[PDB]
Amino acid sequence: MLLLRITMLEGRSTEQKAELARALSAAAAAAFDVPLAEVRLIIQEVPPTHWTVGGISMAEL
């Protein structure tokens, strides 16, 4: 098994999301020593309001 799960803020390009998954998947295949074809990756997106730092939301500001 090798599975990756990204949790990120909304509002990135389609193209950027596809780059993360391609580069992260190759990096993981190579390092953990697993065929690339077995690597799963899941993206989960979050509104600015549901990511907080120091208790206050990214929506600030």
Partner 1 sequence: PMLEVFYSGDRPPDRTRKQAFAAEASAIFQRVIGTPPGRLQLIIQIVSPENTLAVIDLD
- List of residues contacting partner 1 (CB under 8 A): 1-9, 12, 16, 19-20, 23-24, 27-28, 30-34, 40, 42
- Is 46 a binding residue for its own copies by CB under 8 A? The answer is yes
Query: What is the maximal distance between C-alpha atoms in the chain?
Result: 43
Cα separation, 29 vs 59, whole angstroms: 35
33: helix, strand or coil: coil
The distance of closest approach from Cβ of residue 28 to its own copies in the complex, given in angstroms and rounded to an integer, is 9
* Amino acid letter, residue 40: R
Q: Which residues bind its own copies (CB under 8 A)?
A: 5, 7, 14, 17-18, 21-23, 25-26, 36-46, 49-57
